[PDB]
Subunit: 144 residues, 2 copies
Amino acid sequence: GLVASIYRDSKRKIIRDLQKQDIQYVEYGDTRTLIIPTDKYFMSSPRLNEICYPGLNNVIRLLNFYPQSTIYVAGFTDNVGSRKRKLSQAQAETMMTFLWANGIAAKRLKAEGYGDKNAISDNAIIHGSAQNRRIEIQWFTSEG
Amino acid sequence: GLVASIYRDSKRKIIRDLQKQDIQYVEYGDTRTLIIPTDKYFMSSPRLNEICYPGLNNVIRLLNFYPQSTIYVAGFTDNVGSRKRKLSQAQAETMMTFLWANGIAAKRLKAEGYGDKNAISDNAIIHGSAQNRRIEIQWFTSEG
């Protein structure tokens, strides 16, 4: 305790800042999910993104709370259309390279198989442009 | 012949256009290498790059001349410094996702192990900003 006092308090603030930075954090059961609006976070140099986007920087800090969890990433530009699972798989890779480049063990990063039933798509939860173009980062924790 | 007449002529033009678009093509033996200046080709959406950068579009067309060759990609932001093989491995992944997203078999794409002796670094050959920040795409062909 104390160094569990500081950690819990920090995490709550990171989550709140992410919220203000338009990044949603969804929690239910042992599932944790970050929903990133791709129209705001265009994303090549990890340096440009770290330096210019505080939100992406806050995503790293949060993922650093779970250094033992496998991090799953899903892409969804799945709004443009007709029959593009490609560009989705694509931006998912973009996020992964960014996460890796910024300290996340490559072994921990995994790309969600397209159409992965675990991905969130509920418009009751997803708000704004994220309903159309977005990236999701999901992991499982036993902190509860 | 004829459809070998058109192909050879097209390839020579692609190479020439790439040259005008500041992308160098180096040939020697069975080795082929593209040198892309990262200050000009910033690179997340494959659509933005395809649509806005004719040169990157010409790189795809050229790689489509070798649909059976393994495509190696090396990154070099290895100018910024001191002891960043990361960001290099990083932009190499960026190029790969872009190539894949645009039609290049994922099986054909491979990331060069950092410090791969095959990469070109000769300033007699590499010109301009590419001497500092660049991406290279190398493959081997038996066309000769």
